[PDB]
Amino acid sequence: GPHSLRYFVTAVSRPGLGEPRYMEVGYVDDTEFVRFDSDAENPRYEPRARWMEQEGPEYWERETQKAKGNEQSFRVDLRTLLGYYNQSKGGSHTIQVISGCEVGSDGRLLRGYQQYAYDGCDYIALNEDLKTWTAADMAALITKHKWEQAGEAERLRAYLEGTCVEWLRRYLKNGNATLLRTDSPKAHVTHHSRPEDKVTLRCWALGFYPADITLTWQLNGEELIQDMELVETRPAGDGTFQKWASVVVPLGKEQYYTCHVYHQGLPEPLTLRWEP
């Protein structure tokens, strides 16, 4: 299947309390593998997955130096945007950036991207061509003109198509045992009563990797994604994920409803009923 390398960056000002908080968090697919946090006692880039021990001291030194550099540019960005939007110095503001590339199973580039947000709203984004930017408002239009006259798109393009891709391949190789494994879901169904002769049935899926999964409830072969409550697939603290999906049914008619689990580690999808 496809793989991705992504870096989540956040800068958050806190007037009266010192310098903005700056964080970088990197993921290979759905696994966190590196992080930087300015509020650590000794802010360094750190490994978050066991396989990253295969990198030497120079790797960590370089990443740390980048992060400290990036930190400062975002402190300046925060000030700049107060000007663009005519905002006072007394309020907290957030800049978020997502950058990444994705490859097929053969290691070839599928797509690269970089998008910025200010206070939780779209600011500026690299287009799918990797040559031009698109700007959500006139503040970001100023940024767009700056980056065009500087030719920034071209440098970023070279990173996404070259560096990002090659290091992603390297990580998938070094972390093979972890990143290309498949842990199969284990499922079960729970039962909860309700006021008016009705019952909640909840289908759980546990211990699976990768995160992509599909849970559905069925009555008479038709999928019931109408009255289905759901949580987003969520990390379980050990490298695996879990999910649940629930449906409200008539009391005494529980046996006519089936849960279906689809996962790449399930050659044939699971089918479960509620068992007394």
Binding site: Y7, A67, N70, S73, L81, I124
Partner: peptide
């Protein structure tokens, strides 16, 4: 290998 430059806004 993280991006080493985020140009200023």
């Amino acid at each position: 290998f993280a991006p080493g430059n985020y140009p200023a806004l």
